[PDB]
Design a protein around this ligand. Structure first.
Ligand SMILES: Nc1ncnc2c1ncn2[C@@H]1O[C@H](COP(=O)(O)OP(=O)(O)OP(=O)(O)O)[C@@H](O)[C@H]1O
Ligand SMILES: [Mg+2]
Ligand SMILES: [Mg+2]
Lengths: 985, 75, 147
């Protein structure tokens, strides 16, 4: 009874069984500061059985530095009581409660226990009991720019899936008697030594088809070994190998035992000596807090730092840690002990939420065991950081001023950012900006633009939207929510509903872009990302790109004149199958799904478009006759959908659906088998239907079968929708009509002047004149995956399953069909939180105006295996032009609106280069091979007039510049790249 | 004897070979003359693709036969 | 994008293909009308075939859309002019050039591949009755590729 209308995107990451097992586990959360509330939000969105909170401390002002459910009217009230009311509205299936006091035995009521903002002694006391009762225990701590996570899931943890990937499967060419398994030509299995696989459909070696997993010895990228197959046979031909994923046993240690001899996880190999430092540092922090009634060292205080360093020395001596303590790092930890940043809190909350999901679902590889992280490179260097500047001012930004100071806070308050998109990443970025006080000053401003509307499936990871807000614009709702969270941002936020593209340049023009400070992308398509990147490059504004895919995520920062752009590197491609495979010989369910999608487009979309365009364009037939690739096909479609097969009731739609079923599933297969019989051989003598090619078999229509009836119903419903008729779903009418159907005979055909134009004309004139049919339009079927009442995914699933039955392929259910056909990108809330945290950690670097390139870090992470990596951005390539250093990306030529001849003369005389090609937009303004008449006609014209003449469209009033791409050759004719030209209108 | 190999660009290469010469030797001559690796040479005669390990006589290649040199593409 | 397109165009201009000529439509770089000459040692000898090339906005990250315009009787070419080649579907690296695309197309016309056909009936005729295939190809290249 999983609510598939809400967990649609998450179920593609976790699965049905994972969520079924997750919906029976209770989670307790001790500590309700920023990290605790973030973890609670993520867990509630995840869909656990219930959530319990425990934080009886009264609210204070500084606690609002990272809490977004607390207001200044809540000072003095326990955090849990004022937080549960707002947390209960995130998910309706996840009850949230509060416990005033905590007892040890009560801990047995929960499946996972998260501990934050707790002393080390209490953590040890809790762990000594939660370890021997097999309860997952996750302890998190966030001090300034440092974070620590500790996980303990018992001594007999069972991990079903250790990487989250699908089992590797592939085809086999030949298997020798020595266990040498060989793939097909230029086919790499991708297995690793120690993996287990099972073989099926192996010809000549039936023994390997039993299904028993066997060890794998990798011998090369194309072959491997399994051992000895002497008994089973001599040589095996063809077959499929499939990887088998086995459960693993992971054994942890208690907190008390792991304190002496911990097991670190290193997020970066450039700084390998730090985690040992953090292990001592956090224990010393706890000891100092215990020695000052829970009072952390004051910000940038020398005496407290010295005492903390003494405690660090004492602990290091006590534990016999053979590591030299770094005094500078320890004193920095002491200074920022009272820090409370929203970016670090969000990052650690996402990580801990993912760990909780791993613990509950027994999936993915967890942390083992300690994880110490720091972002000390984010510390501002352009402002004076001292005890005087970092002292609290009794405001809600004290937790951040205590790290960065008042001057950097004022710098943040005057930012002018631009957020593209208002999805989940946009919502997280807006929350972080609201917490940080971005654009709360006099000169600050925030602009957010997004044209999409809130849907039901977006509420799973977008916490700023509520079910009552379904169907409204994202930007307005987000702006209202974040203005409610921070009242100081009333009137400082502008929400647009415009798609960022070539058609929105009239609003987001030069005037708009000259006041921005940075651009943050929250998009989901590559074209818009690359357009925004081009715009940022033109205006030279810092850009923040972030992308997620399931549990993987990456963040990149583009800085003017320092790093290369984001469009300069386009790694991730897509896959489009060869047409011969899809059209005739499929061998996987994806092929059938693609074929079904193409069939849907060709049956319900293109013919309707042709019919509608015929009745609108007065000269449609003549244009199509000399423009369309297949005028004959268009004419046939128009005739069939207008006169030949125009339905007058739903029964005729059912008959048409049956006829199409027969056409596509019974006749084409017979034709193919007549052309290529099952006993046919290739040119080399090998059997034709062997290997990737599977012998098909025609299907006979059986009404009692579920799939045939589903296909008939879906096709009839779609046809009726196209013709605007009244559809029915009662099987009685279908069984009554389909009984009286006479299948037309069909026998395969072996085959064996300029009248074609005459035949096409005869077909054309048969069509009724457009004047005869006025106001008669057919409704095209626009594909919509999210709607479950239009029979789209049902029809696609039915067609794919029928085609799979044609080729004896394994059918897929509606869930996977919707995943594949709809191009749904898996998404998670934890990944969104992590990428938002990383982007906001880069944002403080950007604000400080750091100049070196080694101080920025593009980040990548995979939460399935707990992998985190950070690398320096790639510097923008340089070049030598006219004996000068030119940046390839961030340099341009600024010229007036001079004539083309004057531009050529300028490039010939100044740069000493000969212009050979000059283009703008999608037009070729000037080329060296054009006829001399055309050039002489175009030379004495200005650039603006030339563009207007070529593009046949006047320049709009808001346009103020032109971007020209110029390719020029040197004196010797050697091609040399030059930066683009920025013509100023 | 003599044979003619036509390339994809319209060029005609004349070779001095013997009916007993192996396909490997012909691919070697084509690599020596044009610099095309043997792995990428697809030699065709009378609608049949020449395979390594055999001789010209196996394909009934005689005086002034014409072969085709194309790239290894399949699909 | 535009820069790579013009670099390839200049390379075509400087290096004469001698059997093909690809050029943009009017002054649009995202639409070319190329020409291919029928191979001499093929039934399609003495024929001119026109191709339409639509460059995607993500070129060269995505393969160009190349579609035949002149009707041709080939086992691996359907009626709609669609072509059957890997370098257009998933073998499209950023290293390919229309130059080579055309080379490939020509090599295909030189020798068909009936083991993995796109038109099953023509492939069957070619495999069974070679003479009928030769006659049909000659008739088609005379009716469409000539004049
Ligand atoms: N060209 C564009 N201009 C403006 N906003 C855009 C553009 N393209 C995408 N977006 C916005 O980017 C966000 C993408 O986020 P996300 O993919 O999570 O949302 P969605 O597409 O609505 O959901 P789903 O992926 O679950 O179907 C959406 O807010 C969408 O409106
Ligand atoms: Mg949407
Ligand atoms: Mg989306």
């Amino acid at each position: 009874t999983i609510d598939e209308g809400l967990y649609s995107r998450q179920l593609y990451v976790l699965g049905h069984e994972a969520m079924k097992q997750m919906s029976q586990s209770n989670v307790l959360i001790i500590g309700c500061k920023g990290l605790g509330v973030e973890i609670a939000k993520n867990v509630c969105l995840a869909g656990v059985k219930s959530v319990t909170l425990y934080d009886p401390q009264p609210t204070r002002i500084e606690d609002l530095s990272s809490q977004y459910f607390l207001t200044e009217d809540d000072i003095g009230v326990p955090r849990a009581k004022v937080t549960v009311s707002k947390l209960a509205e995130l998910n309706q299936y996840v009850p949230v409660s509060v416990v005033d006091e905590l007892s040890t035995e009560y801990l047995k009521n929960f499946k996972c226990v998260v501990v934050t903002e707790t002393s080390l002694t209490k953590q040890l006391e809790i762990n000594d009991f939660t370890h021997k009762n097999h309860i997952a225990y996750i302890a998190a701590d966030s001090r300034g720019l440092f974070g620590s996570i500790f996980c303990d899931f018992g001594e007999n943890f069972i991990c079903t899936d250790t990487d989250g990937n699908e089992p590797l499967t592939g085809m086999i060419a030949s298997i020798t008697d020595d266990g040498v398994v060989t793939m097909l030509e230029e086919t790499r299995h991708g297995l690793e030594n120690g993996d287990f696989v099972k073989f099926t459909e192996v010809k000549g070696m039936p023994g390997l088809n039993d299904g028993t997993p066997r060890k794998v010895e990798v011998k090369g990228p194309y072959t491997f070994s399994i051992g000895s197959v002497k008994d089973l046979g001599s040589a095996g031909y063809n077959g499929v190998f499939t990887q088998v994923k086995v459960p693993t046993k992971i054994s942890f240690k208690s907190l008390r035992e792991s304190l002496k001899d911990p097991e670190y996880v290193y997020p970066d190999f450039g700084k390998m000596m730090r985690p040992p430092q953090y292990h001592i540092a956090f224990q010393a922090l706890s000891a100092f807090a215990d020695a000052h009634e829970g009072s952390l060292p004051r910000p940038r205080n020398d005496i407290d730092a010295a005492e903390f360093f003494e405690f660090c020395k004492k602990i290091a001596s006590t534990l016999q840690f053979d590591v030299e303590l770094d005094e500078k790092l320890i004193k920095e930890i002491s200074y920022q002990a009272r820090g409370d940043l929203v970016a670090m809190s969000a990052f650690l909350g996402g990580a801990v939420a993912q760990e909780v999901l791993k613990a509950t679902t027994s999936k993915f590889y967890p942390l083992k065991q300690y994880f110490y992280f720091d972002s000390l490179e984010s510390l501002p260097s352009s402002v004076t950081i001292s005890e005087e500047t970092c002292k609290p001012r009794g405001c809600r930004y004290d937790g951040q001023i205590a790290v960065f100071g008042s001057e950097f806070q004022e710098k943040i308050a005057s930012l002018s950012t631009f957020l593209v998109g208002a999805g989940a990443i946009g919502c997280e970025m807006l929350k972080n900006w609201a917490m940080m006080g971005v654009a709360t000053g006099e000169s600050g401003h925030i602009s957010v633009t997004d044209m999409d509307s809130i849907e039901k499936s977006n509420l799973n990871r977008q916490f700023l939207f509520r079910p009552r807000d379904v169907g409204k614009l994202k930007s307005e709702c987000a702006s209202t929510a974040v203005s409610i969270m921070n009242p100081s941002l009333t009137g400082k936020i502008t929400s647009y509903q415009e798609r960022v593209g070539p058609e929105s340049e009239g609003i987001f023009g030069d005037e708009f872009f000259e006041k921005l400070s940075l651009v943050t992308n929250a998009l989901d398509n590559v074209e818009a990302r690359m357009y925004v990147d081009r715009r940022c490059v033109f205006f030279e504004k810092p850009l923040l790109e972030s992308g997620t895919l399931g549990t993987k995520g990456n963040t990149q920062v583009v800085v003017p004149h320092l790093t290369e752009s984001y469009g300069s590197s386009q790694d991730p491609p897509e896959k489009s199958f060869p047409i011969c495979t899809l059209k005739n010989f499929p061998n996987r369910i994806e092929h059938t799904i693609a074929w079904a999608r193409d069939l849907f487009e060709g049956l319900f979309k293109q013919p309707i478009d042709n019919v509608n365009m015929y009745l609108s364009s007065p000269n449609f037939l003549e244009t199509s006759l000399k423009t369309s690739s297949n005028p004959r096909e268009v004419l046939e479609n128009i005739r069939d959908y207008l006169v030949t097969e125009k339905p007058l009731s739903f029964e005729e739609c059912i008959m048409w659906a049956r006829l199409q079923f027969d056409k596509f599933f019974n006749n084409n297969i017979q034709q193919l088998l007549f052309n290529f019989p099952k006993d046919s051989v290739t040119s080399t003598g090998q059997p034709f239907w062997s290997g990737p090619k599977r012998a098909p078999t025609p299907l006979s229509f059986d009404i009692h079968n579920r799939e045939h009836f589903d296909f008939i119903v879906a096709a009839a419903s779609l046809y009726a929708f196209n013709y605007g008729l009244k559809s029915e779903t009662d099987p009685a009418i279908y069984e009554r009509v389909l009984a009286g159907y006479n299948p037309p005979p069909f026998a395969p055909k072996s085959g064996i002047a300029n009248k074609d134009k005459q035949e096409l004309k005869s077909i054309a004139d048969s069509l009724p004149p457009p004047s005869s049919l006025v106001g008669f339009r057919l409704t095209p079927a626009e594909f919509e995956k999210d709607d479950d009442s239009n029979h789209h995914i049902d029809f696609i699933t039915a067609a794919s399953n029928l085609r799979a039955m044609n080729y004896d392929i394994t059918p897929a259910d509606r869930f996977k069909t919707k995943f594949v056909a709809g191009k749904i990108v898996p998404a998670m809330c934890t990944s969104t939180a992590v990428v938002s945290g990383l982007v906001c950690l880069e944002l403080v670097k950007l604000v400080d105006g750091k100049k070196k390139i080694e101080e920025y870090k593009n980040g990548f992470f995979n939460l399935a295996i707990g992998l985190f990596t950070f690398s320096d951005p790639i510097a923008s390539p340089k070049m030598k032009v006219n004996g000068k250093e030119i940046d390839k990306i961030w340099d341009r030529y600024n010229l007036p609106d001079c004539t083309l001849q004057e531009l050529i003369d300028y490039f010939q005389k100044e740069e000493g280069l000969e212009v050979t090609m000059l283009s703008s937009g999608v037009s070729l303004l000037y080329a060296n091979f054009q006829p001399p008449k055309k050039l002489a006609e175009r030379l004495p014209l200005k650039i603006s007039e030339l563009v207007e003449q070529i593009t046949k469209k006047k320049l709009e009033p808001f346009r103020k510049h032109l971007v020209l791409e110029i390719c020029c050759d040197d004196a010797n004719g050697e091609d040399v790249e030059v930066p683009f030209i920025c013509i100023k209108l | 004897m003599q044979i003619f190999v036509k390339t994809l660009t319209g060029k005609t290469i004349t070779l001095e070979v013997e009916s007993s010469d192996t396909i490997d030797n012909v691919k070697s001559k084509i690599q020596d003359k044009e610099g095309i690796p043997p792995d990428q040479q697809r030699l065709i005669f009378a609608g049949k693709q020449l395979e390594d390990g055999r001789t010209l006589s196996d394909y009934n290649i005689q005086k002034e036969s014409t072969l085709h040199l194309v790239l290894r593409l399949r699909g | 994008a535009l820069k790579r397109i013009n670099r390839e165009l200049a390379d075509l201009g400087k290096d004469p293909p001698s059997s093909s000529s690809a050029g943009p439509v009017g002054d649009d770089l995202f639409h070319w009308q190329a020409t291919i000459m029928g191979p001499a040692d093929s039934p399609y000898a003495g024929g001119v075939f026109f191709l339409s090339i639509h460059f995607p906005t993500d070129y060269p990250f995505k393969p160009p859309k190349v579609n035949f315009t002149t009707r041709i009787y080939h086992p691996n070419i359907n009626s709609n002019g669609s072509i059957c080649l890997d370098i257009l579907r998933d073998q499209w690296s950023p290293a390919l050039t229309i130059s080579k695309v055309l080379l490939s197309i020509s090599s295909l016309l030189t020798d068909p591949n009936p083991d993995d056909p796109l038109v099953p009936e023509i492939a069957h005729v070619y495999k069974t009755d070679r003479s009928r295939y030769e006659l049909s190809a000659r008739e088609w290249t005379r009716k469409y590729a000539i004049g």
